[PDB]
Amino acid sequence: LVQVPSARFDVAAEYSAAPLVTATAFVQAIINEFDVSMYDANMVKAAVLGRYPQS
Amino acid sequence: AKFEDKVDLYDDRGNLVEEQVPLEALSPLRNPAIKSIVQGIKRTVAVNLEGIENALKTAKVGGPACKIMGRELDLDIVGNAESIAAAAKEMIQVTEDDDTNVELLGGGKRALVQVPSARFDVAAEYSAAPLVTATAFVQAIINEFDVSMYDANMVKAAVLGRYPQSVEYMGANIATMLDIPQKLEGPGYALRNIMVNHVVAATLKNTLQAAALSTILEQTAMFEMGDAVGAFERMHLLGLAYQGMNADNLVFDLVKANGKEGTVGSVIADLVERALEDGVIKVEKELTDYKVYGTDDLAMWNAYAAAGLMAATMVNQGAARAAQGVSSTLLYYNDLIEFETGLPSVDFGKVEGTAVGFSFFSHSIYGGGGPGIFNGNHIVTRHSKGFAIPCVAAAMALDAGTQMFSPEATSGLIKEVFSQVDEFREPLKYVVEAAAEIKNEI
Amino acid sequence: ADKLFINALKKKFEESPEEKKTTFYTLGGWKQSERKTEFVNAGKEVAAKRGIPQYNPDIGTPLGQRVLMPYQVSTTDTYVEGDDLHFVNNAAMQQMWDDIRRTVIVGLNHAHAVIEKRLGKEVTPETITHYLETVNHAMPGAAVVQEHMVETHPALVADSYVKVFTGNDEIADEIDPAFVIDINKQFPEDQAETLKAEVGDGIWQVVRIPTIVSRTCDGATTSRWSAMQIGMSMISAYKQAAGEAATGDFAYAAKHAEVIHMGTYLPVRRARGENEPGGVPFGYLADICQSSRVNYEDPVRVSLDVVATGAMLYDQIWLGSYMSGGVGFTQYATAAYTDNILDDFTYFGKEYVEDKYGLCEAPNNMDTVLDVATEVTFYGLEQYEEYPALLEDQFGGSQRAAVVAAAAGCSTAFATGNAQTGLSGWYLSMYLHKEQHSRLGFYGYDLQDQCGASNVFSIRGDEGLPLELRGPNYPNYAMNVGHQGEYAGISQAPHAARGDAFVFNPLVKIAFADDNLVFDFTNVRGEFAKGALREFEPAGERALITPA
Amino acid sequence: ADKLFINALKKKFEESPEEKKTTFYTLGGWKQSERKTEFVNAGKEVAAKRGIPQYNPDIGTPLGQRVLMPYQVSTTDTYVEGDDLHFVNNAAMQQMWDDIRRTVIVGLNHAHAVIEKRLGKEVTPETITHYLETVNHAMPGAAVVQEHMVETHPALVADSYVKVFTGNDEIADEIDPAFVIDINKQFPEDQAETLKAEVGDGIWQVVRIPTIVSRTCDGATTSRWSAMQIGMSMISAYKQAAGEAATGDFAYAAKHAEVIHMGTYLPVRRARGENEPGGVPFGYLADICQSSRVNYEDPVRVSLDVVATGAMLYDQIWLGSYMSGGVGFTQYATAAYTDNILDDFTYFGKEYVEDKYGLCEAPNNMDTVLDVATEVTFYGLEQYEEYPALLEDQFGGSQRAAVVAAAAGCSTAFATGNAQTGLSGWYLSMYLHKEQHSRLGFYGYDLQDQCGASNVFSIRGDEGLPLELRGPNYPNYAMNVGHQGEYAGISQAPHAARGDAFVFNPLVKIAFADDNLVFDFTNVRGEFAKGALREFEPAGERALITPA
Amino acid sequence: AQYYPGTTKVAQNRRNFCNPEYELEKLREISDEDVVKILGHRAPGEEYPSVHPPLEEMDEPEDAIREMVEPIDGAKAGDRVRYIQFTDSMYFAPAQPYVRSRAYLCRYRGADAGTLSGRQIIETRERDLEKISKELLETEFFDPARSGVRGKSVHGHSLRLDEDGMMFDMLRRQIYNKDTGRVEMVKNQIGDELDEPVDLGEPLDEETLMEKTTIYRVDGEAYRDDVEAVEIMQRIHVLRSQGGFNL
Numbered sequence A: 001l002v003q004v005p006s007a008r009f010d011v012a013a014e015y016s017a018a019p020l021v022t023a024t025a026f027v028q029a030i031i032n033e034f035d036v037s038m039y040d041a042n043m044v045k046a047a048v049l050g051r052y053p054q055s
Numbered sequence B: 001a002k003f004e005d006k007v008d009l010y011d012d013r014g015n016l017v018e019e020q021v022p023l024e025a026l027s028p029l030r031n032p033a034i035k036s037i038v039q040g041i042k043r044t045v046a047v048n049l050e051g052i053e054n055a056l057k058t059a060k061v062g063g064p065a066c067k068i069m070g071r072e073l074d075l076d077i078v079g080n081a082e083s084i085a086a087a088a089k090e091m092i093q094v095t096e097d098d099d100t101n102v103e104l105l106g107g108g109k110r111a112l113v114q115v116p117s118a119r120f121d122v123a124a125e126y127s128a129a130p131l132v133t134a135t136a137f138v139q140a141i142i143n144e145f146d147v148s149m150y151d152a153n154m155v156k157a158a159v160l161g162r163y164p165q166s167v168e169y170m171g172a173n174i175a176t177m178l179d180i181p182q183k184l185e186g187p188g189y190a191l192r193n194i195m196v197n198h199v200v201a202a203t204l205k206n207t208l209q210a211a212a213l214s215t216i217l218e219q220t221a222m223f224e225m226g227d228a229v230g231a232f233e234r235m236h237l238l239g240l241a242y243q244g245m246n247a248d249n250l251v252f253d254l255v256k257a258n259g260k261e262g263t264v265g266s267v268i269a270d271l272v273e274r275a276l277e278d279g280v281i282k283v284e285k286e287l288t289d290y291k292v293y294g295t296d297d298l299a300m301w302n303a304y305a306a307a308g309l310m311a312a313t314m315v316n317q318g319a320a321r322a323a324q325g326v327s328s329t330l331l332y333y334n335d336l337i338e339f340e341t342g343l344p345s346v347d348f349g350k351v352e353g354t355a356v357g358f359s360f361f362s363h364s365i366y367g368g369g370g371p372g373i374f375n376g377n378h379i380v381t382r383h384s385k386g387f388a389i390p391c392v393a394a395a396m397a398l399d400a401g402t403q404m405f406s407p408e409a410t411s412g413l414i415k416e417v418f419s420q421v422d423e424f425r426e427p428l429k430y431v432v433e434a435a436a437e438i439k440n441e442i
Numbered sequence C, D: 001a002d003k004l005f006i007n008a009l010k011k012k013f014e015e016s017p018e019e020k021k022t023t024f025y026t027l028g029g030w031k032q033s034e035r036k037t038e039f040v041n042a043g044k045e046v047a048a049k050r051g052i053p054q055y056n057p058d059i060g061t062p063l064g065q066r067v068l069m070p071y072q073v074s075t076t077d078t079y080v081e082g083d084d085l086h087f088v089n090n091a092a093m094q095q096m097w098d099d100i101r102r103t104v105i106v107g108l109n110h111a112h113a114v115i116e117k118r119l120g121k122e123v124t125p126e127t128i129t130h131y132l133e134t135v136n137h138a139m140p141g142a143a144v145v146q147e148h149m150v151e152t153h154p155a156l157v158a159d160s161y162v163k164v165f166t167g168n169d170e171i172a173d174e175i176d177p178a179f180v181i182d183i184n185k186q187f188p189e190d191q192a193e194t195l196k197a198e199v200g201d202g203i204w205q206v207v208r209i210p211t212i213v214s215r216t217c218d219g220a221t222t223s224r225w226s227a228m229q230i231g232m233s234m235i236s237a238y239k240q241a242a243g244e245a246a247t248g249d250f251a252y253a254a255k256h257a258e259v260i261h262m263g264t265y266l267p268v269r270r271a272r273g274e275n276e277p278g279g280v281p282f283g284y285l286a287d288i289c290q291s292s293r294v295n296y297e298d299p300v301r302v303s304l305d306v307v308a309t310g311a312m313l314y315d316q317i318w319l320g321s322y323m324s325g326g327v328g329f330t331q332y333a334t335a336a337y338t339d340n341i342l343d344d345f346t347y348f349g350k351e352y353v354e355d356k357y358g359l360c361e362a363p364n365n366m367d368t369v370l371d372v373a374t375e376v377t378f379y380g381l382e383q384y385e386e387y388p389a390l391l392e393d394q395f396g397g398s399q400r401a402a403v404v405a406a407a408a409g410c411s412t413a414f415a416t417g418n419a420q421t422g423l424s425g426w427y428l429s430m431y432l433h434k435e436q437h438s439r440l441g442f443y444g445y446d447l448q449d450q451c452g453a454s455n456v457f458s459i460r461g462d463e464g465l466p467l468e469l470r471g472p473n474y475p476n477y478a479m480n481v482g483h484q485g486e487y488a489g490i491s492q493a494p495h496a497a498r499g500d501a502f503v504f505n506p507l508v509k510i511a512f513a514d515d516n517l518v519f520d521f522t523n524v525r526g527e528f529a530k531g532a533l534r535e536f537e538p539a540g541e542r543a544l545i546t547p548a
Numbered sequence E: 001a002q003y004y005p006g007t008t009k010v011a012q013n014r015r016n017f018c019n020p021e022y023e024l025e026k027l028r029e030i031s032d033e034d035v036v037k038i039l040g041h042r043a044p045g046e047e048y049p050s051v052h053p054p055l056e057e058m059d060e061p062e063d064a065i066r067e068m069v070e071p072i073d074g075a076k077a078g079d080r081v082r083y084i085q086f087t088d089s090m091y092f093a094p095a096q097p098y099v100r101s102r103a104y105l106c107r108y109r110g111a112d113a114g115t116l117s118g119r120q121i122i123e124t125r126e127r128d129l130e131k132i133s134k135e136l137l138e139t140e141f142f143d144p145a146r147s148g149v150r151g152k153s154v155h156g157h158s159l160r161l162d163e164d165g166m167m168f169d170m171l172r173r174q175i176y177n178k179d180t181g182r183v184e185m186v187k188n189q190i191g192d193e194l195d196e197p198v199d200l201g202e203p204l205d206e207e208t209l210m211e212k213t214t215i216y217r218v219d220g221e222a223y224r225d226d227v228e229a230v231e232i233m234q235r236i237h238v239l240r241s242q243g244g245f246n247l
Ligand code: F43
Pocket: C325, C326, C327, C328, C329, C330, C331, C332, C333, C395, C396, C397, C398, C399, C440, C441, C442, C443, D138, D142, D143, D144, D145, D146, D147, D149, D150, D228, D229, D232, D235, D242, D243
């Protein structure tokens, strides 16, 4: 369960900071946890947020 | 306390305001003046009462060259603007003492509306501003003249246009700096889909203020997009500081030194020297008669390079007093600096790339247009994460009349209303003062 | 004397139209029909050729336990089986949509000011004519500047061209008349004066891209393709650098600043770009139809030619294919343009209104709505009751709902001269019909009709809109058959009674007043009939680049 | 021993390919060309029939001051003028896009669970066969339930059908083989085994709607049309009420919960619905191409057939018409599939890698990128420098940049077995090329390429994506020619070298292994040649319903 | 400034074009009126058109940037923005496309330069354009056989030469005179005939083209053999690659 801090919405136009801030924090935390290489980290991104931004 | 950097902050005359401000005092996440700018842009609407009245009287509603013969309604809206605006304010406000503002402009022809913050506190996004304002003015006009049930739909069409048959408010006589949520190129982009001409219009063509408003909007969007989270946060904050807030007077001082006779190339040489002088970069290796520079702080090199980029625009486009070359400056500033130094250009090539397509899509047949119609949400100019568009705003501010799609043509209603708001018009002043004010809370 | 539908009913059935009983089950199922017979035979050839079973009359239930009826195309003496009015089987219908999809209206007013103010050059009728010769080479897909360009085959793209119009008779007269839509020739004199006043001295291009490209691609292609070849032709005819900063102002003007799309883009659940059917507002569809300039002494004929145009496009192609597909919605639409049934009901209402009020002379209020919509509703439903053949012909309740309501709505607008009261009349018709027969349409037919009365006069954000501005993307209207084309007709009705030259957009009206179109928009129902009979010749075919 | 493009250069020019001088200006302009001569005469015919000037060789500048060259379609012995490779003049190219646009993949796994769990009925190979006979009647536009339905002409929709596949060989053997895509017949043993393991016991439909509907309507029509006739066929074959609550589960399954579109919908500035070229991700395009199953010992050939597929679709039809239009972008794309030039450079790099590392055996890092991409880049640019005829053939810098980088990026993926380092090699090739000749492509060519290096390995929101998931809507790629087709090739490259059966989606790969398709996806460059010679017979023509 | 890495003659030529203190060699003399004729934007002795009123007649925002940045003379007067465009042969023309844009933004103020494979352009205020154009046409930026002034129909950078050593021009704007061994401009840059042709001098000979060129080629100096230049390009790739991933 993740609840992104209110202060991020206070200076945002809408609500997509929740998924986007959560996704990148977990992507970077996973990469950092296992020291995933530069070459393979794009796979962790795809596993978290999917086909975005092509979709 | 997350970052140790400090910056000195100046005004748009090059005078020091406040020394040694922690970098995070300029974060969108912490600075109250950036919050107020964003909340302001979300909630402010411009109403064209004259346009509504003319649309009704001619029955020209619902988009370009549209008209409905026999539907004409002759109502003296501008003549009764005070009454209508006061009636509209009653519906727009939540309570009598809140931050609702309704102000008549141009003898009743226009109105500045700021919808109360309480409505946005229980809203997903920002469309309550136009929709609450539009319905309050439709209802106030109908109530003012006792327009019949049979005819009132024409008042709706004169205010909000062909919506909902069109997705947009097509032919509307209201305007906002933001655009509808459906037109976002990605989630998190709304603060990018603000035309450069609107930014230049609101800041009255003051170059540094336009650069400041543009950079605040761009870098704040970078937090909503998540781009300024974790590893990249500091790069974005140093970019806001040095490229858009004239941190350390670096932009200002490069323009001063190159303004009379300089070129892109001369600004570059001054910047590299200054980065050398400050310890940001240093010689890593010597080739044959060629020094390769290195840096132990890429984020700070990027910011210094970014500050150089802004100043080269102001010098190059300022010397022409013609904005079109900003696309060239964004390209060759970065191309030249890489072969000058052996270090990556601003935003690691992304400014340069943005500038390549922006040049194409402003000097060809296939699309874009002049510099003033672009923005961070435009497909041509979304690619750099905050480091390209603020240069465009500065170039359009310096244009002396070479454009057909100038701010006067695209942004006249935005200028008349949004330039009234002090924080929109002179954001560099408010943001620096706030950062000074919270400087010990970091 | 006879109702107008009596001839059709007599051609369909051996019984007089008043008889209440008939014979079923002994007609031979599909074997009664020449067209079904053709289809069974073709199914067998198809399946054998490709190695996969296809059309088979023994699958599912056995068609033709009742009479499979011929339909009269209203206003004609053509009778065809309904399969011949399926859009897939009818090249006139396909070409009608292509002619709209491939058209965009693009001003020259901003472009000419770029030329004079930014480039510092002159614009004259001579330069305009030179430009129009240039763009009539370029637009079909041929080159004007670069060396070693490869080009479209002129014969495959013969239907692509660019014309202009303007309200300034003296300018119009100087341009080569090959390129000019002549407002004074195409429109009766009062209409011409209105339209020329609207346009004034603006000069507007009507651009048509090739049908072959519109079929390969989509509607959102049209304005892009148009802008490319306008931009090349401006470079060539006015001598810019071939790609300088000022070139970009022509691009922006042609794609955005002085462009009139036929349709606007749609929201994500029905994601489509510009120039698709769902973006075409009802008032534009009325103005595309050219019945107004030829039949202007008969407001019924004008209105019901609009109904035919919209019922085919919006129910058969749009809702019946783009938004669904399969066998689809032929006869939900054919009810509004066949057997002269809508025409009989609508001519009744026109005569009622004419005799009681005078056209356009009723008060614009609910008292007129209640009066006219009720009287015409009771008239139409009574025909179904007095002629069992008529009820067997329009067998689906949805079909009868749309036909009776269209007559009631159109007649109400003939009385008030206002579309919005016409629309109220449509909804009231539905409610009265539902109570009279204890049925109305298909399971989901009256979503919009139950929201209907309350939303006619609403002013709220996604509720309130004059009818002329509504279209297929008006929220209540976004899903269902048997309404959109009739709404286009009600939009036309008051303007036809008033003698107005256009309903919503005078540029759109003039843009389709063009004899170089493939489809004849002056006689929509005549064209449907020609396509049904396999006599219409479309653009876009690939025969020249394929084997013999 | 010769470079592969030497025959082509000898065909085009009188000089030896190494000669630096030639003769211009005395070739007769357009009169040197058979094709331009056909076009001039056709333009006269057109203009005289319609009353409006059209193609005219004297508008603008005079083509053919240099040699208007023939092009060899790569891997063939067919030489044609470039105009014959324009998508407008080539029915093979139009049909390739129609076969993609009109296809949707629809599971039967949820549907069969509705039947068993909600209706409480049984599903076996026999019920599925009955269901498939029913849906092959209904899918083209014919009826199974109601009385008095009017239907599509079976011969107009002969290219519409439904097939199934499954990974369970014993189930597949019990369904009538007319309806089954046979994985063991279509794929080599090891590929078959991989694909069957991905599918397992799932059963999936491949649905193709009629080309004539696809051309009338749009890509987003396909999954709707599919769902309508799946729904009718489920009602008929499994004895539901025709319209009960459980009917809705089938509708949601077919449109939403087990549907695989060819392309996803696009954002508003390039508003389009599903199954348009811009939504097709590069990995799917590589899987649509069927070179992998036939040319599986030659990873260069597989990869360059993907490049041809994507350069035509993405540059000629998508960027050159949907997103722009006019003369368009034929030779920006033909550079990657003509004269055996990309083939020469890529075989060079494949051989280099194979000899130095072994395919797929180089370390997946920047050292390999720097090695392979630099070496191949320098090979390709040397050919243009050594053969003046080659540089005059690929006369536009963009064409050269795309070709040279495609070779470099494919070669780099050949070495690492990973697309992402292949893509890094593409961008490094552009940077080296730009410095070597002091030029790269057209004005806006390297927007993506200057962003490129940094975004290859980024993980940020709208930046980070494996190459296989990227497509025409990846932000930096959304606008420009001379990249998208090449990227589809680089996505194929590492999988071809590995011998993988698919690049990104195994259902998409099986779906196009179907001999009832019109276009032959196993030999894309062969088909382009056939269409250029006017020998390809497309679906969707209206000859049967128009005058002889 | 160091401008560009590398140890070939090409790399030194690239650095020289950029360096504003390097005096371009003058090869030919052209009148002011013939510059105006070649541009084709106005007739000699025609007043400069304007796009806006002179700067001193307008009321400008109080703006320290405006105050610090001196306007070029054409900006002060309100001149049109106009252009001159060149095409450079890959057969050893002295200047080349990216070399021009890099050098233009190092030497010239108020410049909008664009680089393409077959054309390179600068747009600036008309009276200032006329001054730059003199230097672009009179110095070793230009050779009359291997370079071309072309506002449209630019084809020819990548084509074989004709028998005289001249680059292809679809519109044949530059005509080689066998009798003098000199080239004349017969048309302006957009292709309209000049009343009187303009002498552009003699083409540089093979050995002088080799000494002055900025293109790398296997039959000249190959880029792959300028190993220090290649090393910096590879370094930029690597550092951009790593910065986009992390910092
Ligand atoms: C399965 C459904 C429910 C569903 O959502 N749509 C159906 C079926 C669908 C199929 C039937 C084709 C076929 O037979 O295989 C199509 C042609 C749509 C498609 N998939 O192509 C259609 N309906 Ni229906 N549907 C129709 C109609 C109607 C009327 C028919 C009433 C009667 O008394 O005959 C009723 C609704 C009502 O009661 O008002 C109706 C029902 C039904 N409609 C019932 C099946 C009825 C039955 O079992 O007989 N249609 C009509 O009212 C007129 C037009 C007609 C459509 C074809 C065309 O327009 O030509 C067709 C439109």
